[model samples]
Target: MGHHHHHHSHSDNNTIFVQGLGENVTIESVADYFKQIGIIKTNKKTGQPMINLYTDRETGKLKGEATVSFDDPPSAKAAIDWFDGKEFSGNPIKVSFAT
Candidate 1:
Protein backbone atom coordinates (compact mmCIF):
# COMPACT_ATOMS: atom_id res chain seq x y z
CA MET A 1 0.00 0.00 0.00
CA GLY A 2 1.72 3.16 -1.12
CA HIS A 3 -1.04 5.76 -0.90
CA HIS A 4 -4.00 5.60 1.44
CA HIS A 5 -7.44 5.77 -0.08
CA HIS A 6 -9.70 8.26 1.67
CA HIS A 7 -12.46 8.51 -0.86
CA HIS A 8 -15.89 9.29 0.48
CA SER A 9 -18.98 7.84 -1.11
CA HIS A 10 -21.39 10.14 -2.91
CA SER A 11 -25.16 10.20 -2.75
CA ASP A 12 -27.69 10.74 -5.51
CA ASN A 13 -29.73 13.30 -3.67
CA ASN A 14 -29.05 16.85 -4.86
CA THR A 15 -31.74 18.55 -2.85
CA ILE A 16 -31.22 19.80 0.70
CA PHE A 17 -33.78 20.42 3.38
CA VAL A 18 -32.98 23.15 5.87
CA GLN A 19 -34.69 23.77 9.20
CA GLY A 20 -34.43 26.23 12.08
CA LEU A 21 -34.02 29.00 9.55
CA GLY A 22 -34.71 32.58 10.40
CA GLU A 23 -37.70 34.48 9.14
CA ASN A 24 -35.44 37.00 7.48
CA VAL A 25 -34.00 34.35 5.21
CA THR A 26 -34.71 35.01 1.55
CA ILE A 27 -33.75 33.62 -1.81
CA GLU A 28 -31.06 36.22 -2.35
CA SER A 29 -29.71 35.68 1.12
CA VAL A 30 -29.64 31.94 0.61
CA ALA A 31 -27.90 32.33 -2.70
CA ASP A 32 -25.28 34.51 -1.08
CA TYR A 33 -24.33 31.70 1.26
CA PHE A 34 -24.89 28.62 -0.87
CA LYS A 35 -23.51 29.97 -4.12
CA GLN A 36 -20.11 29.92 -2.49
CA ILE A 37 -20.35 26.14 -2.51
CA GLY A 38 -21.57 25.32 -6.00
CA ILE A 39 -24.16 25.87 -8.71
CA ILE A 40 -27.77 25.87 -7.53
CA LYS A 41 -30.38 23.85 -9.34
CA THR A 42 -33.04 25.75 -11.19
CA ASN A 43 -36.71 24.88 -11.58
CA LYS A 44 -37.44 23.51 -15.02
CA LYS A 45 -40.97 24.81 -15.17
CA THR A 46 -40.61 28.06 -13.26
CA GLY A 47 -37.07 28.86 -14.40
CA GLN A 48 -36.17 29.93 -10.89
CA PRO A 49 -33.64 28.56 -8.48
CA MET A 50 -35.19 25.75 -6.44
CA ILE A 51 -35.37 27.52 -3.12
CA ASN A 52 -38.56 26.61 -1.38
CA LEU A 53 -39.19 28.56 1.78
CA TYR A 54 -42.07 27.09 3.68
CA THR A 55 -44.46 29.60 5.17
CA ASP A 56 -47.16 29.45 7.79
CA ARG A 57 -50.60 28.91 6.33
CA GLU A 58 -52.28 31.50 8.52
CA THR A 59 -49.43 33.86 9.36
CA GLY A 60 -47.98 33.85 5.86
CA LYS A 61 -44.51 33.97 7.39
CA LEU A 62 -41.60 31.66 7.11
CA LYS A 63 -41.87 28.51 9.20
CA GLY A 64 -38.17 28.10 9.82
CA GLU A 65 -37.96 25.44 7.16
CA ALA A 66 -36.85 25.50 3.54
CA THR A 67 -35.53 23.29 0.79
CA VAL A 68 -33.10 23.96 -2.03
CA SER A 69 -31.78 21.89 -4.88
CA PHE A 70 -28.24 22.14 -6.15
CA ASP A 71 -27.10 21.46 -9.67
CA ASP A 72 -25.18 18.40 -8.52
CA PRO A 73 -25.18 15.93 -5.68
CA PRO A 74 -21.75 16.97 -4.46
CA SER A 75 -22.98 20.50 -3.85
CA ALA A 76 -25.75 19.20 -1.65
CA LYS A 77 -23.36 17.02 0.31
CA ALA A 78 -20.93 19.86 0.71
CA ALA A 79 -23.68 22.16 1.86
CA ILE A 80 -24.76 19.71 4.56
CA ASP A 81 -21.23 19.20 5.79
CA TRP A 82 -20.57 22.94 5.81
CA PHE A 83 -23.81 24.36 7.17
CA ASP A 84 -25.35 21.71 9.39
CA GLY A 85 -25.90 23.23 12.84
CA LYS A 86 -24.19 26.39 11.66
CA GLU A 87 -25.37 29.83 12.51
CA PHE A 88 -27.13 31.57 9.64
CA SER A 89 -28.67 35.00 9.89
CA GLY A 90 -28.21 34.99 13.68
CA ASN A 91 -29.94 31.60 13.99
CA PRO A 92 -28.63 28.08 13.96
CA ILE A 93 -29.80 26.25 10.86
CA LYS A 94 -29.92 22.53 10.16
CA VAL A 95 -29.05 21.16 6.75
CA SER A 96 -29.72 17.67 5.45
CA PHE A 97 -30.28 15.83 2.21
CA ALA A 98 -33.93 15.78 1.23
CA THR A 99 -35.48 12.37 0.72
Candidate 2:
Protein backbone atom coordinates (compact mmCIF):
# COMPACT_ATOMS: atom_id res chain seq x y z
CA MET A 1 0.00 0.00 0.00
CA GLY A 2 3.05 2.29 0.44
CA HIS A 3 6.76 2.57 -0.40
CA HIS A 4 9.96 2.21 1.59
CA HIS A 5 13.75 1.62 1.31
CA HIS A 6 16.27 -0.53 3.19
CA HIS A 7 19.65 -2.28 3.11
CA HIS A 8 19.66 -5.93 4.02
CA SER A 9 22.36 -8.47 4.70
CA HIS A 10 25.87 -7.20 4.23
CA SER A 11 26.76 -10.35 2.32
CA ASP A 12 23.83 -10.32 -0.08
CA ASN A 13 21.97 -7.15 -0.95
CA ASN A 14 20.64 -8.36 -4.28
CA THR A 15 17.32 -9.71 -3.06
CA ILE A 16 14.49 -7.21 -3.20
CA PHE A 17 11.10 -7.80 -1.66
CA VAL A 18 8.46 -6.05 -3.67
CA GLN A 19 4.96 -5.09 -2.53
CA GLY A 20 1.75 -3.23 -3.49
CA LEU A 21 1.35 -5.15 -6.69
CA GLY A 22 -2.00 -5.93 -8.30
CA GLU A 23 -3.43 -9.42 -8.25
CA ASN A 24 -3.01 -9.70 -12.01
CA VAL A 25 0.70 -8.99 -11.90
CA THR A 26 2.66 -11.79 -13.55
CA ILE A 27 6.09 -13.11 -12.74
CA GLU A 28 7.21 -12.60 -16.28
CA SER A 29 6.02 -9.02 -16.15
CA VAL A 30 7.93 -8.30 -12.98
CA ALA A 31 11.10 -9.82 -14.35
CA ASP A 32 10.76 -7.87 -17.55
CA TYR A 33 10.15 -4.65 -15.67
CA PHE A 34 13.36 -5.14 -13.72
CA LYS A 35 15.13 -6.15 -16.89
CA GLN A 36 13.95 -2.98 -18.52
CA ILE A 37 15.32 -0.99 -15.62
CA GLY A 38 18.66 -2.88 -16.10
CA ILE A 39 18.84 -4.66 -12.77
CA ILE A 40 17.48 -8.16 -13.35
CA LYS A 41 20.20 -10.68 -12.55
CA THR A 42 21.32 -13.95 -14.00
CA ASN A 43 22.88 -17.10 -12.64
CA LYS A 44 26.64 -16.74 -12.31
CA LYS A 45 27.46 -20.32 -13.30
CA THR A 46 24.58 -21.64 -15.38
CA GLY A 47 23.86 -18.24 -16.92
CA GLN A 48 20.17 -18.86 -16.36
CA PRO A 49 17.73 -16.42 -14.90
CA MET A 50 18.23 -16.03 -11.15
CA ILE A 51 14.94 -14.52 -10.13
CA ASN A 52 12.04 -16.02 -8.13
CA LEU A 53 8.43 -14.84 -8.11
CA TYR A 54 5.67 -16.05 -5.82
CA THR A 55 2.20 -17.11 -6.97
CA ASP A 56 -0.72 -19.15 -5.59
CA ARG A 57 -0.55 -22.82 -6.53
CA GLU A 58 -4.19 -23.45 -7.31
CA THR A 59 -5.23 -20.05 -8.60
CA GLY A 60 -1.71 -19.23 -9.88
CA LYS A 61 -2.54 -15.60 -9.25
CA LEU A 62 -0.16 -12.94 -8.03
CA LYS A 63 -0.12 -12.56 -4.25
CA GLY A 64 0.87 -8.90 -4.35
CA GLU A 65 4.54 -9.45 -3.54
CA ALA A 66 7.73 -11.01 -4.91
CA THR A 67 11.39 -11.57 -4.07
CA VAL A 68 13.80 -10.56 -6.81
CA SER A 69 17.42 -11.50 -6.20
CA PHE A 70 19.86 -10.05 -8.63
CA ASP A 71 23.55 -10.51 -9.47
CA ASP A 72 24.57 -7.36 -7.61
CA PRO A 73 23.54 -5.14 -4.71
CA PRO A 74 23.70 -1.72 -6.34
CA SER A 75 21.40 -2.94 -9.08
CA ALA A 76 18.89 -3.87 -6.42
CA LYS A 77 18.95 -0.34 -5.11
CA ALA A 78 18.46 1.00 -8.60
CA ALA A 79 15.48 -1.29 -8.95
CA ILE A 80 14.15 -0.16 -5.59
CA ASP A 81 14.06 3.42 -6.78
CA TRP A 82 12.80 2.52 -10.23
CA PHE A 83 9.42 1.15 -9.16
CA ASP A 84 8.63 3.71 -6.48
CA GLY A 85 5.72 5.29 -8.35
CA LYS A 86 5.41 3.11 -11.41
CA GLU A 87 2.32 1.23 -12.55
CA PHE A 88 2.08 -2.46 -13.26
CA SER A 89 -0.95 -3.33 -15.33
CA GLY A 90 -2.57 -0.20 -13.89
CA ASN A 91 -1.62 -0.70 -10.23
CA PRO A 92 1.25 1.12 -8.57
CA ILE A 93 4.13 -0.97 -7.16
CA LYS A 94 6.60 -0.54 -4.30
CA VAL A 95 10.11 -1.97 -4.10
CA SER A 96 12.51 -2.40 -1.19
CA PHE A 97 15.44 -4.48 -0.05
CA ALA A 98 14.63 -7.78 1.59
CA THR A 99 15.22 -6.80 5.17
After superposition on all CA atoms, what RMSD does each candidate show versus the true structure? Answer: 6.8, 6.2
Stretches off by above 4 angstroms in model 2 are: 1-12, 43-48, 56-60
RMSD, candidate 1, Å: 6.8
What do the candidate models score in CA lDDT, each in turn?
0.83, 0.74
Q: Which ten residues in a row have the lowest lDDT in candidate 1?
A: 1-10
Model 2, C-alpha of 89: deviation from truth (Å): 1.5
Candidate 1, 1-99: lDDT as tens digits:
447556555555888999988877786577678888899977668766889888889989888788888889888889989999898888899898888
Residue 32's lDDT in candidate 2: 80
TM-score of 2: 0.67
Q: Which residue pairs in model 1 clash with each other?
A: none
Any runs in candidate 1 off by more than 4 Å, and if so which? 1-10, 44-47
* Per-candidate clash tally: 0, 0
Error of 2 at 79 (Å): 0.8
